[PDB]
Structure prediction request, 155 residues.
Amino acid sequence: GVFTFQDEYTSTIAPAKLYKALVTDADIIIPKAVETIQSVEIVEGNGGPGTIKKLTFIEGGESKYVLHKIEAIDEANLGYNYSIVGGVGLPDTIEKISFETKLVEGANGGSIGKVTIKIETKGDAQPNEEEGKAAKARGDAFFKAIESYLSAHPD
Ligand SMILES: COc1ccc2[nH]cc(CCNC(C)=O)c2c1
Ligand SMILES: COc1ccc2[nH]cc(CCNC(C)=O)c2c1
Ligand code: NA
Prediction:
């Protein structure tokens, strides 16, 4: 099956500066800002499409990682697309999960962060609702931590 999900986040922060933190300078900023993420590193590639990044994080007290493959990166248009290509544990019935993200101008010089998630499953399997809830919350917390960090570090 094929399933879509969307979420949106608002910030008082300007979109180009949020995108620099989230994407350009992600390998430095994300582990500083996000207290459950230990590291974000390039496993292979030059930063462009095809690049594989490894995000190491703690969950339930246990060290885990996930691998992200960069699918599109467009700084001019504040766009970044990636799919999950590996990690700890099993996908179970999840064949594929990709993300499409964009930042746009929001209220009073601020931003809106838009994320579209596309999940492909085996046959008639449905995406797990408890894991969806957890993912949704993680996304919220992630975007919020980045905002906190940038605010606490004017520039
Ligand atoms: C969670 O909210 C958003 C919103 C707009 C976004 N743009 C770019 C990213 C970063 C995507 N990097 C990772 C490791 O997921 C993003 C996140
Ligand atoms: C609360 O922040 C966290 C904590 C652990 C994590 N592992 C992986 C991600 C990336 C999350 N990116 C998006 C677009 O949802 C992550 C975020
Ligand atoms: Na961290």
